[PDB]
């Protein structure tokens, strides 16, 4: 079906969910998780129709289950296309929290993309986070 499709996000979504279930049943098949992440990215890029938020949530959940080598966090390198960072705006607090948990580069790329397009969606939260970190680290 994916061999015949042109702009079918449903095929990508079903393949990603299949791989996610396969990874869930056996918690040692990292390649399945990587394929699921790549498929979710493809489907989200194809949709652009408010159904990408669930895929983004699944991607964020998958990213936090990675290993030291970062095997799962490679679908970004294996994926070609644009991101459409508008649909990531609702998840800014999660990205801010995660930029200090094992996956800082991947969330920092998205945050940098957002900073250049929607500054008013990020200014206040970024300022509060900066003050909090400054107080905590070097009180």
């Amino acid at each position: 079906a994916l061999y015949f499709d042109i702009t079918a996000a449903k095929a990508w979504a079903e393949w990603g969910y299949f791989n996610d279930r396969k990874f869930k049943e056996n918690p040692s098949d990292l390649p399945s998780a990587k394929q699921a992440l790549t498929s979710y990215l493809q489907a989200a890029s194809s949709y652009k129709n408010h159904k990408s938020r669930k895929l983004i949530a699944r991607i964020l959940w998958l990213l936090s289950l990675d290993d030291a080598n970062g095997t799962i966090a490679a679908g970004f390198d294996d994926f070609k296309g644009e991101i459409y960072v508008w649909w990531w705006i609702i998840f800014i607090p999660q990205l801010l929290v995660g930029l200090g948990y094992k996956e800082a580069p991947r969330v920092q790329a998205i945050l940098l993309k957002i900073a250049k397009t929607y500054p008013q969606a990020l200014y206040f939260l970024l300022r509060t986070n900066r003050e909090d970190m400054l107080t905590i680290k070097k009180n």
Binding site: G100, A104, Q108, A115, Y123, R130, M133, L134
Partner: peptide, 12 residues
């Protein structure tokens, strides 16, 4: 983390 936050703020 604060270095990454400062980099984001500088870009912004």
């Amino acid at each position: 983390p604060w270095e990454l936050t400062e980099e984001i703020m500088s870009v912004l």
